[PDB]
Design an enzyme around this catalytic site. Structure first.
Site, PDB file in Angstrom:
ATOM      1  N   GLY A 128      51.432  28.573   2.778  1.00 25.15           N
ATOM      2  CA  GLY A 128      50.732  27.325   3.015  1.00 25.15           C
ATOM      3  C   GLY A 128      49.225  27.452   3.097  1.00 25.15           C
ATOM      4  O   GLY A 128      48.686  28.538   3.298  1.00 25.15           O
ATOM      5  N   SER A 176      54.646  25.724  -1.253  1.00 21.15           N
ATOM      6  CA  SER A 176      54.922  25.529   0.165  1.00 21.15           C
ATOM      7  C   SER A 176      54.916  24.058   0.561  1.00 21.15           C
ATOM      8  O   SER A 176      54.224  23.243  -0.050  1.00 21.15           O
ATOM      9  CB  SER A 176      53.867  26.255   1.000  1.00 21.15           C
ATOM     10  OG  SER A 176      53.915  25.849   2.355  1.00 21.15           O
ATOM     11  N   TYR A 224      60.208  22.931   4.562  1.00 20.97           N
ATOM     12  CA  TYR A 224      60.113  23.072   6.006  1.00 20.97           C
ATOM     13  C   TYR A 224      60.603  21.708   6.462  1.00 20.97           C
ATOM     14  O   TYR A 224      60.170  20.686   5.925  1.00 20.97           O
ATOM     15  CB  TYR A 224      58.673  23.232   6.485  1.00 20.97           C
ATOM     16  CG  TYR A 224      58.156  24.646   6.531  1.00 20.97           C
ATOM     17  CD1 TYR A 224      58.947  25.690   7.012  1.00 20.97           C
ATOM     18  CD2 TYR A 224      56.845  24.925   6.169  1.00 20.97           C
ATOM     19  CE1 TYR A 224      58.435  26.978   7.138  1.00 20.97           C
ATOM     20  CE2 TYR A 224      56.324  26.204   6.290  1.00 20.97           C
ATOM     21  CZ  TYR A 224      57.122  27.222   6.776  1.00 20.97           C
ATOM     22  OH  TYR A 224      56.589  28.483   6.907  1.00 20.97           O
ATOM     23  N   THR A 276      63.080  27.449   4.376  1.00 23.11           N
ATOM     24  CA  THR A 276      62.563  28.483   5.267  1.00 23.11           C
ATOM     25  C   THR A 276      63.049  28.156   6.668  1.00 23.11           C
ATOM     26  O   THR A 276      62.796  27.072   7.195  1.00 23.11           O
ATOM     27  CB  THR A 276      61.040  28.549   5.219  1.00 23.11           C
ATOM     28  OG1 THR A 276      60.638  28.881   3.886  1.00 23.11           O
ATOM     29  CG2 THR A 276      60.522  29.621   6.174  1.00 23.11           C
ATOM     30  N   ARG A 309      54.549  37.576  10.787  1.00 20.33           N
ATOM     31  CA  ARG A 309      53.767  36.502  11.391  1.00 20.33           C
ATOM     32  C   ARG A 309      54.479  35.669  12.445  1.00 20.33           C
ATOM     33  O   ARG A 309      53.845  34.838  13.108  1.00 20.33           O
ATOM     34  CB  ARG A 309      53.248  35.574  10.286  1.00 20.33           C
ATOM     35  CG  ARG A 309      52.313  36.261   9.306  1.00 20.33           C
ATOM     36  CD  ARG A 309      52.098  35.435   8.049  1.00 20.33           C
ATOM     37  NE  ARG A 309      51.309  34.220   8.253  1.00 20.33           N
ATOM     38  CZ  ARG A 309      49.989  34.195   8.417  1.00 20.33           C
ATOM     39  NH1 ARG A 309      49.290  35.323   8.417  1.00 20.33           N
ATOM     40  NH2 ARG A 309      49.360  33.031   8.533  1.00 20.33           N
TER      41      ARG A 309
HETATM   42  C1  LIG Z   1      48.651  32.900   4.900  1.00 14.15           C
HETATM   43  C2  LIG Z   1      50.145  32.863   4.866  1.00 14.15           C
HETATM   44  C3  LIG Z   1      50.827  31.565   4.893  1.00 14.15           C
HETATM   45  C4  LIG Z   1      52.261  31.438   4.806  1.00 14.15           C
HETATM   46  N1  LIG Z   1      52.850  30.177   4.709  1.00 14.15           N
HETATM   47  C5  LIG Z   1      54.177  30.032   4.483  1.00 14.15           C
HETATM   48  C6  LIG Z   1      54.791  28.707   4.171  1.00 14.15           C
HETATM   49  O1  LIG Z   1      54.103  27.689   4.138  1.00 14.15           O
HETATM   50  N2  LIG Z   1      56.188  28.730   3.867  1.00 14.15           N
HETATM   51  C7  LIG Z   1      57.055  29.910   3.885  1.00 14.15           C
HETATM   52  O2  LIG Z   1      58.189  29.819   3.623  1.00 14.15           O
HETATM   53  N3  LIG Z   1      56.467  31.116   4.190  1.00 14.15           N
HETATM   54  C8  LIG Z   1      55.158  31.204   4.440  1.00 14.15           C
HETATM   55  N4  LIG Z   1      54.550  32.483   4.588  1.00 14.15           N
HETATM   56  C9  LIG Z   1      55.420  33.677   4.511  1.00 14.15           C
HETATM   57  C10 LIG Z   1      55.561  34.194   3.087  1.00 14.15           C
HETATM   58  O3  LIG Z   1      56.378  33.393   2.329  1.00 14.15           O
HETATM   59  C11 LIG Z   1      56.141  35.593   3.024  1.00 14.15           C
HETATM   60  O4  LIG Z   1      57.366  35.630   3.846  1.00 14.15           O
HETATM   61  C12 LIG Z   1      55.289  36.703   3.617  1.00 14.15           C
HETATM   62  O5  LIG Z   1      53.922  36.571   3.283  1.00 14.15           O
HETATM   63  C13 LIG Z   1      55.797  38.012   3.074  1.00 14.15           C
HETATM   64  O6  LIG Z   1      55.041  39.162   3.570  1.00 14.15           O
HETATM   65  P1  LIG Z   1      53.783  39.838   3.006  1.00 14.15           P
HETATM   66  O7  LIG Z   1      52.635  38.916   3.327  1.00 14.15           O
HETATM   67  O8  LIG Z   1      53.650  41.203   3.631  1.00 14.15           O
HETATM   68  O9  LIG Z   1      54.054  39.921   1.532  1.00 14.15           O
HETATM   69  C14 LIG Z   1      53.108  32.701   4.727  1.00 14.15           C
HETATM   70  C15 LIG Z   1      52.404  33.992   4.731  1.00 14.15           C
HETATM   71  C16 LIG Z   1      50.995  34.134   4.770  1.00 14.15           C
HETATM   72  C17 LIG Z   1      50.440  35.527   4.680  1.00 14.15           C
END
Ligand SMILES: Cc1cc2nc3c(=O)[nH]c(=O)nc-3n(C[C@H](O)[C@H](O)[C@H](O)COP(=O)(O)O)c2cc1C
Ligand SMILES: Cc1cc2nc3c(=O)[nH]c(=O)nc-3n(C[C@H](O)[C@H](O)[C@H](O)COP(=O)(O)O)c2cc1C
Ligand SMILES: Cc1cc2nc3c(=O)[nH]c(=O)nc-3n(C[C@H](O)[C@H](O)[C@H](O)COP(=O)(O)O)c2cc1C
Ligand SMILES: Cc1cc2nc3c(=O)[nH]c(=O)nc-3n(C[C@H](O)[C@H](O)[C@H](O)COP(=O)(O)O)c2cc1C
Lengths: 353, 353, 353, 353
Positions: free
Chosen positions: C78, C105, C128, C153, C255
């Site tokens: 996102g 996203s 979401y 998700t 996260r």
């Molecule tokens: C800045 C940021 C925003 C994210 N926003 C979302 C989101 O809106 N929807 C979702 O399903 N996952 C979200 N994620 C998780 C990612 O889909 C993914 O699981 C994750 O980045 C994988 O790990 P990595 O950053 O080590 O590759 C986000 C990750 C980051 C780094």
């Protein structure tokens, strides 16, 4: 601040010339061995027994059937005079005041005879064999002067590669005597008394000393005999089969073979296999290290560098202080784990990590 | 920035005199124990259960059969007045506002009676036995003033060797009172009232207190009794067999025996063996640490230093803030792992690493 | 120097405002999770198969039965507009040029409709659920505009405790749009259209979304449906039983829950248990990380931060460059381990460490 | 201070241009591989056999049935001229003076013929296949000039991703010759002699070389043939089944695949499965590393960077010095572990850690 062995190491480093400190503290090659000697103790943690009456504690224990104040000994270390004047006597007197044995090195700066005349404690003699005849001479000398126990060190067939010494071009201090080799004739001509001169003018030991030679030594010495430098239950067992009264598991404080296992790795196995006294050294600095070894079955722990830090920093008094701290340390530990009598220690107080 | 317990530790370090901070934060000897207390939590990771309705969560739980807001307690810590004025009352009021019990230390700066009169929360009393008669006096005093639970601390038979205190020559702050020992007569002459004076003028406890003595205490106290300081399922089980209503697995926050195991190492085993409440402390700082212990079966977790950082940094409000953060932390964790009701936690949410 | 993903991370850190970089790079609490996500890959090493003709290699593979250039996808992230202008479109166009899918996203800065009109690649939509009705609206919108796959998700029932954001008082950038929630009425009065307004004016999702709700979503979406955020073979299996066409094992890039296991820990088990496509993300940075997951059975790997570094550093071209490097990385790795066809990967090329 | 291999590495770093040193020392990608190559040796420690007569020691051993001074070889390394003038000859002469074989690289700066004419030691030839016809030419050239053994290197189907070189834009030094490819015609027109020109004007090898091709090479070479670059007992066994006389387990010094296992991980298994000579390289720096491999069954250890440090630092004399130090190191180690004859080494002298 002098509250533990490390504090004395720090003070010793400040008082000793760098090259001497390096000679004392250094290990073979990468020094992964001395580090492993320390780290291995973290393989065990304590599981105290609570609600045990520890108001009356005892550190008294028999070593080779003879009672002493605590299961510790000041082990054999050569050139003690390089750390403090008359270092051998200082260590011996401190050990004696503490009620524990002192082991004189073949490479001591004070003679077998002189120490026996100036100290009435329990004196042990550690033998290095360079020349058979010369070794026999020292053994009988130790026998006639009152030494109770003989320790054969077997882990210096060749000299360890200690790189700090190579960098410092370390040379045995001039004011320092290899007293036990004093007076041994020359002028004399013939195989030996020429084959013997050639062996003494060499910094290497008799690398041929084997099991057959141990049998020879066993017949020469009538009292307790221990073999030091073992790193396997198999070798410990063979020593007992060959006549030894016990063994000292040791890697020579990481000074000979950097990749050697720590003796703690074969302690329990050696105790179970031999059924005879298994003493140990190498890496001991805290009372907890000592208690862990005793719990695993060790008869006693020999101190090497720990008491040498006390000696180098503050002479005889320094050694007294280190022994006092370690004794209080062991005592405190026994109280904390619920084992008031040190002879009651067992593996049950430990948790493998 | 005050978003977690570590942030309060940082603020506490800035506000407390160095020696006081060292007295609070320090551990025994090399402090490998306090480090192990923290590191052990990394032996478990979470395996969340997804698609579980966690819109309605509950942290409410019974401890010793009595419901409280969350499975936490502010554990017994002595000399709280050295960290913040009337520290004992501040901690008690914060615990009460949070809906959890507060345990008063025998070495508190506020008396058993005074606290009970100024706080209507669930007050527990932690007992240290120095002199049997004196201990009996405190126990009955706690009984008559409304304390619901009695906790016997058994891991200070002798004092821990905390080297930071030795370096700082740490001395119990002058404006600080060992109130519970106040007024206890002298002038009186005879074995006791002389044998008792001699025990109080000593910084050591009754090292003879054993299982037989526990039976004595069990008959004296009519309500819930817990034994604190245990580090084995065997000892925990014996405590239950001797009459205890539960136990508190603990290594005293790494302040007594540096090489002691972490209580987390015997938590599951103690829960399975005793079949009675198993509370725990030592090393808890994050909500995840707490949830891991609860998942392994702990009835509740007692906080030691965590809330003391809040106290030292910002008094009662600081304690309130730490409890608020930890509660939100636990709540958040429950939502994230898919276990809306804290009482539903089980080993199934964990992965051994 | 831009030769790998880390080089782009370094460039991104130099170009992004500190607070934005922290928002991107940060993890939950102590960040032990993001570290574990990286470290876990060292649990496997390669055992190459030599003398295999690798002169002709293929990275082509089917994902959910549909062929794509390589087993990678740009995962849903996102607020991409906070990293680079029209970031969503840049990522989508780069993915499309590379021959792989892009997942939009729910919290994107470009609407479902606008992206579909400006990019003809394989677009997936990540959902979401904050409000059921609103979610249904987005799902149908994605359906009518050509999105091929729907990803639910499930690991943000509550918001992760990311302390860097708390320290920076991080606020969603002003020039940034939560476009998909645009125009959704008010003025309207009554339970919903009031119960819905109350849910949107909240930064939290529908924490009640459970298995029953998944069934609801399954009937609403007619194409491929994946459930993202799973960390157990059991949950993955239940998702398949409930109608899902596959799953995405993930801990949301460390996260959300700092102590969560890495999805790599349950990858092989999930593949064996479900018998359906198991995709994965979290911690992937090197081609070797990707190949290890594929060898363990993963259908494909979704990139999160890796391509975002390319985006933040150099926009669309940066993403193209990162994908180019990763593809060459994977290709090189396949040649080196003797597996010319990526679909031939198996556990046989790995050694557990 | 030049007392071990690391000391020569330090001196080499001071004398070589940074980019050349990086080309020599660097590994693939994160360089976790070169680190693992070193760290893996700590998985074994020594359990010395005491009281063994080690006064007479022997390092002499047969390699492929041919006796040499010690179980070491200077392995094939390309572009040696970039480290020291006429580096290939310096290494060959040092190896010859030490009584061990030298392996000439296909990418050497001195031709197969010129070396054979200037050195009468045991010369081995390492083959890289870029073009079949050209390879056949080199093989026959090596055969006709006296090379005793042929080594086929199989782990460079594609070039390793060494990032230090990418950062330095490393270019093969101008004064440097790929001599073995000298004179090979052009002007000639037609498939080959055009298909061959196209292969030589490429920095990549024949990635199609497989088991069938090995059979081809086996029939071309009449003497001892070894396959280098294997990382599995299965591949080693297949090589023997295809005609090889032995193998060289190796990961090319961590220069090709960062996540490759260390060959030490499959050494014992390869020895047991093949029943034929298993040589090994990658990560050897100390005599203890070498002795551990020999104890696990390795026929001999090939040195890569160790002797190159001697070469880069002090030319031929530097190589002589490194070989002298390593020989004394091995000898010392044998004495210390109680294995006077190097051919008597076995797993019994090791302890798995
Ligand atoms: C800045 C940021 C925003 C994210 N926003 C979302 C989101 O809106 N929807 C979702 O399903 N996952 C979200 N994620 C998780 C990612 O889909 C993914 O699981 C994750 O980045 C994988 O790990 P990595 O950053 O080590 O590759 C986000 C990750 C980051 C780094
Ligand atoms: C300076 C120094 C000299 C030594 N000299 C001898 C010696 O002459 N005889 C012997 O048997 N061991 C000798 N040792 C080894 C010790 O007896 C003992 O094995 C070792 O110090 C134990 O390890 P530690 O130093 O960690 O306690 C010496 C050790 C040191 C530190
Ligand atoms: C400053 C301080 C004083 C303590 N005083 C006592 C005491 O009087 N009685 C007791 O039972 N435990 C005492 N403890 C131990 C605690 O009850 C508890 O076991 C320990 O703090 C738990 O570990 P933690 O600090 O990591 O949470 C004390 C701990 C600290 C940090
Ligand atoms: C500078 C350099 C060049 C190399 N060139 C070649 C080569 O031309 N042929 C070959 O078979 N291996 C080559 N190798 C690999 C070595 O034969 C050997 O596998 C490797 O150096 C062993 O690891 P070590 O450097 O840790 O000893 C090279 C290694 C280095 C360090």
């Amino acid at each position: 601040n002098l509250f533990n062995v490390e504090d004395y190491r720090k003070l010793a480093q400040k008082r000793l010339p760098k090259m001497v400190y390096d000679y004392l503290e250094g290990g073979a090659e990468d020094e992964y061995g001395v580090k492993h000697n320390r780290d291995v103790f973290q393989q065990w943690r304590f599981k105290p027994k609570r609600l045990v009456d520890v108001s009356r504690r005892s550190l008294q224990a028999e070593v080779l059937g003879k009672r002493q104040s605590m299961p510790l000994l000041i082990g054999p270390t050569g050139l003690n005079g390089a750390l403090w004047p008359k270092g051998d006597l200082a260590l011996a007197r401190a050990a004696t005041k503490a009620g524990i044995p002192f082991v004189l090195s073949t490479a001591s700066n004070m003679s077998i005879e002189d120490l026996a005349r100036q100290c009435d404690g329990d004196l042990w003699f550690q033998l290095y064999v360079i020349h058979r005849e010369i070794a026999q001479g020292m053994v009988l000398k130790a026998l006639h002067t009152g030494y109770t126990t003989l320790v054969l060190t077997t882990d210096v067939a060749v000299n360890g590669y200690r790189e700090r010494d190579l960098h410092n071009r370390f040379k045995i201090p001039p004011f320092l005597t290899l007293k036990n080799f004093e007076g041994i004739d020359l002028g004399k001509m013939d195989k030996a008394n020429l084959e013997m001169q050639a062996a003494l003018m060499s910094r290497q030991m008799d690398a041929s000393f084997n099991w057959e030679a141990l049998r020879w030594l066993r017949d020469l010495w009538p009292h307790k005999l221990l073999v030091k430098g073992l790193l396997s239950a198999e070798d410990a067992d063979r020593c007992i089969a060959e006549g030894a009264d016990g063994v000292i598991l040791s890697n020579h404080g990481g000074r000979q073979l950097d990749c050697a296992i720590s003796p703690m790795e074969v302690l329990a196995q050696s105790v179970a296999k031999t059924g005879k006294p298994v003493l140990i050294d190498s890496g001991f600095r805290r009372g907890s290290d000592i208690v862990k070894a005793l719990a695993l079955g060790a008869e006693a722990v020999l101190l090497g560098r720990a008491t040498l830090y006390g000696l180098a920093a503050r002479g005889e008094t320094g050694v007294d202080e280190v022994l006092t701290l370690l004794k209080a340390d062991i005592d405190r530990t026994l109280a904390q784990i619920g084992c008031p009598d040190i002879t009651s220690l067992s593996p049950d107080y430990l948790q493998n990590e």
